[PDB]
Amino acid sequence: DDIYKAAVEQLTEEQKNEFKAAFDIFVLGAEDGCISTKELGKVMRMLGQNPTPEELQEMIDEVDEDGSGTVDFDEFLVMMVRCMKDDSKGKSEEELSDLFRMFDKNADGYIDLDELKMMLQATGETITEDDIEELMKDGDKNNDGRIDYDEFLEFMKGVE
Amino acid sequence: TTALVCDNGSGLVKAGFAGDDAPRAVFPSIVGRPRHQGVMVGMGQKDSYVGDEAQSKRGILTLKYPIEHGIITNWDDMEKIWHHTFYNELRVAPEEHPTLLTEAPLNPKANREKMTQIMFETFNVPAMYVAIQAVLSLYASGRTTGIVLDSGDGVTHNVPIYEGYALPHAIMRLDLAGRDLTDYLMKILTERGYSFVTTAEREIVRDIKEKLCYVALDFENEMATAASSSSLEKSYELPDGQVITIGNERFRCPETLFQPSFIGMESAGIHETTYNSIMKCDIDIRKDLYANNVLSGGTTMYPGIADRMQKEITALAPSTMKIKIIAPPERKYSVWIGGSILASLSTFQQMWISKQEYDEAGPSIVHRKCF
C-alpha cells in the first residue's frame, strides 16, 4: 500500500481521478472527495467488511500534521493507501541500533544537531534546513538537544 | 510464519492470527444434529451443523455444547468444532501454523493431554502451547501485577499475580458462570408465565439476559423500588412477536454472582472470593493487588458491575487501602488479545512444544518444563 503509493507517486494527477472513479463504482454518491467513517464503512459493508471508525480516525490523526483533521488531495491518496498495512517489522532493530551507535562520533550516548547535520551532509541528498528542523523535532521529543536510545527507536519506529 | 491464537472457551470460540487487535472469527461452539424426520429429497441436508450455522437453523436442531465447565465432555464434537474453525472460518491448513490454545486453571490433566494429542495427531500442527486463561488477560491490560477475575461462561477463576510470579496457592476457581445465570434466568422467568424449555429457547433466554439484565448497586433498595413503581419494566420482542415484560427479574438474574445461594451453591460470591484470594497472598503485596484488580471474561460485561464489586470490596477491605477495578471496554476479547500479544513476542518463540519433542515423550510432555 505505502509501497504502491510511492510507486504511483511517479504518475500523473489523473490517477487520482481514476481512484475517485473506482470509489464511485463501489459506492457512488460521494461528492466532497474526503473519505469519512461513513463512506469507508459503507464500501466495506458492500464488500462484506467493517473497519473500526477508531482506526479510521487514528489514520486521520497520524496523516495530519497541521491539526486540520481533513485530507488534501495528496493526503487523500495517503488516507486511501492507509486502508491496508504493508510496512512490516520496521526493517531491523539491531541494524538501526548499530547505525545509531555509529552516529555517535564522540561516543557520548547521544546525537546532537551537529551530528545530524554532519550525517545529512554525508548523505548529500537534496535537502533544506526546514527538513533538518522537522527531523530534529520528530527525533528530539524533550528538546534537550540530544537523541536518546528510546527516542531514537521511536523516531525510527515503523521505518524500513 | 504466523501463529494461530485459538481460544476454545465455553460458549464462544474466538480465533485469529497472532498480531492483530480482534479475533477474526467469533461464533458459538454448539453442534446440533437434526431431530425431526425430513421429507424433502435432495435438499442437501447435513448430519450436523456446527458453529454459527446452527444458530440459524436452531428451530429444528438439538444444540448441545461440547464443553461443560472448562473441561471437555464430548471429544468427537470438540474435534468437529476445531476442524470447522481451522478450515472454514480461517481457511488455513493447520500443517503450517503453530497454535496457542487456552485452558482454565485447575482443570483435569487428561483434558489437556487429550487436547495436545488431538492437535498433534489429527490436525498435525507444527507446534502447540497451552496457556492459562488468566495470564493472557493480564497481558492484555499491559500490567505485570494484579489479581484477575476472569468470569467466563463456563467457569469463574481468580488468579493473583505479582511481578510476574504467579501464586499457585491462591487460585480460587468457582464453577458459577454465565451458563448458570442463563439457567437461573430461564427458571425465574416462569414466575410471570413465560416458559422456555427447549434447548433452542435457551438461546433466546441468553439473548434476553445479554440485552436487558444489569447488576444492581444495592440489592434491597432495587427490590423495594421495583415492587412499588414501574420504571424498570423493559419489554422485549420474541423471535415471533408476543412481546414480554421483564420486571425485577432484570437485576435478580446477575445478582446470583454475588449471592450463589440463589442457585443453591454454598460458596461465597465473586465479591468475597476475590478478597479471600487476596488474603491468602503474602502481607506485603496486598496493597498492589488491591490497587490493580482486573476484570475480564464475558460475564463481567453487565452494566454496573464495576461499581458494585468495588463497593463490596471496599466494605470488606481495610479502610486505608485504595480499591481500584480495571474494567477495559474490550473485556470480552481480553483473553484473546493477550494471547495474540504473547504469541507475538520474540522471547516466547522457543517455548512452543515442538513436534519432535512430543514424539520422544508422548502426550505427557505438556506437564513437563514446556508447561
Binding site: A6, L47, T123, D150 | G16, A18
Partner: protein
Amino acid sequence: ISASRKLQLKTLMLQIAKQEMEREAEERRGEKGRVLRTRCQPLELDGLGFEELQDLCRQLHARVDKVDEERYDVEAKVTKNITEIADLTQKIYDLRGKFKRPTLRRVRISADAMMQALLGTRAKES
C-alpha cells in the same frame, strides 16, 4: 509537508550510515590484519644448526606459553566484562520493560481479497 520526502530522507540517512559502517569495518579489518602481522615475529627457518634449531623451537614454545597465559587473562577479563554488560542490559530492560511491548498491526481485516471478490480484477494494487 508530506512525510514521503521525510521518509526518503531518513532512508537515505540509514543507507549512508550502513555504507559508512561497512567502510569503517573493512578498514578496521585491514588495520587489524596489518597490526597482527606486525606483532608476530617473523620465522627464520633457514641456515640453523640442529641443536640451534631445537633451542629456537624451545624458545618459541616458551613464548607460545607466555602468549597463551596473556590471551587467557584477556579472555577472562572480556568474559567478566560480557557478564557485567549482560547484567547492565538486564537492568536496562527492567527499567525499560513493563508496558513497553510493541504490538503488531493486524486489526485491519483483509481488504484486498474482498475488493477483488466484489470487483473482479480491477484492484491492481492488491
